[model samples]
Target: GLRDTRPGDTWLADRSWNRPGWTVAELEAAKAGRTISVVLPALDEEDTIGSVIDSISPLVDGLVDELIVLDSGSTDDTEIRAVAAGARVVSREQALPEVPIRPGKGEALWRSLAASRGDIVVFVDSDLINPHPMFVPWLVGPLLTGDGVHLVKSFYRRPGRVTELVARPLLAALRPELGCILQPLGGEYAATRELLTSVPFAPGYGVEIGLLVDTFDRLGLDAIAQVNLGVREHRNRPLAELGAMSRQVIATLLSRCGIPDSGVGLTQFVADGPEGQSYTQHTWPVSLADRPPMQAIRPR
Candidate 1:
């Protein structure tokens, strides 16, 4: 029979919570000396980096011990703005000089594990247009309060294009157990340091779903929980630009489901000739590299 398991139903009912249910003081008291680090994986986000850091700065000393911006080869003033807003900015190459640098958001996130030292690591995207302050506390609250909760994911109102067109349908068809997760591709979430370092990270847009699936495989549905963060708005990419994202996302999901060597090239067509008479094909390689768990690597 094709149906939801009793365990999954029960897990969904018991594990979900709201952001307004917690406060900064309560989270600070719940901290109990456990350190929390807030990390923003950024690249050329000068306009929003400073404001994003400002949203999280108030909780730095009490709830968050360290705030780091993992800059991935930004040519803009991202580093300067992040530093000006009271965050320690670490570049991609500086975080892990031994390994060659890759071009993707996940590369910065994977290296963030090496750059930051905290018991609980909270990841928030830097390209947000309207940054909110409670995102960090709500994400970190579960780990501090609930026993055995290792990863806390944020669920919100808006869903990205690639998430709906690619990730949602793919999960429903393949990994049905995680279909209940509303925002599997959301960038803002929190996890314990132990779990973050022990799992592989996909070096592209696939990173979010990859982490969610890997966490479920290793720790089970009970170890994961979702928080209603209300609404999240971020920079949106054009339709043509999303094909490669779709490819990387599908490749990562398929690779995790016992299928390796998925195609990386995404091909699309555009009519450029007069009166749209001729068509041109564009093909680019989407990222497929997955960084090994930090615990497995030993840099000399």
Candidate 2:
């Protein structure tokens, strides 16, 4: 039976955790021969990828079956450093050669599903400044122990700007049942392969929220859980880039909640001169196209 989860403190008490509930030994014991895959979707992140991989490498043999870096056409040394730090690197083209590859973090994740084999799949962003070893365990703990938990989301000390301004406010107005989630846009999360392969993934920055809403709709609130991973510090993007990110996120939220496609682009203003009298309008083509569930297309 699906639990009807209410928003606010009650939901937090029932569904959230302050920390990961298990030790490495406990995780190993509970794994019970099931496979785990840790995926880091990377672009040109040569500076941080190696250290992130190093942090999680200790869990590879006992708990994780594979550590994969889903490379999305990095011209930098991302692939080289990832391999040096010990990860099976799969390029975007290599994963699903039959179809045309798109440019986005979610595309890399979607492709990763076909490239790696694991009963449970964990996704960690490659640009984390503080890539703690416990981050992986923090996310996978509930999936390994809880009876019906299929998705585990991470929360940190503070939400990012996009999360605080866009996702939270939108969830409050549109899907308040999900308003309890502190980090609806957080990238560090884990899920069963069955669950991961069953939902459509947004082909851009909206991937995190899209997955959360889809999981709640399909499996109900009982299937979702959250772990507080203490503090997470990631490389921040330029302020201008977040406008594009917000558009994808807004589109995902609206489309998921049955809002009709308006077919509009996100428009932003840029000062054309130092006098500030002239401005340039930039309309970004933020696509809401989501890749279908891997279960539908995965080769048997």
**Which lDDT tens digits does candidate 1 get at residues 203-239?**
7788989999999889888888877666677877877
Which candidate's lDDT is highest? 2
Residue range 117-144, candidate 2, lDDT tens digits: 9999999999998677888876777777
Residue 284 lDDT, candidate 1, scale 0-100:
65
TM-score of each: 0.91, 0.92
Off by over 4 Å in 1: 1-20, 273-275, 298-300
Superposed Cα deviation of residue 197, candidate 2 (Å):
0.7
* Segments of candidate 2 deviating more than 4 angstroms: 1-21
Model 1 scores a C-alpha lDDT of 0.82
The CA lDDT of each predicted structure is 0.82, 0.84
Angstrom error of the Cα, residue 192, model 2: value is 0.6
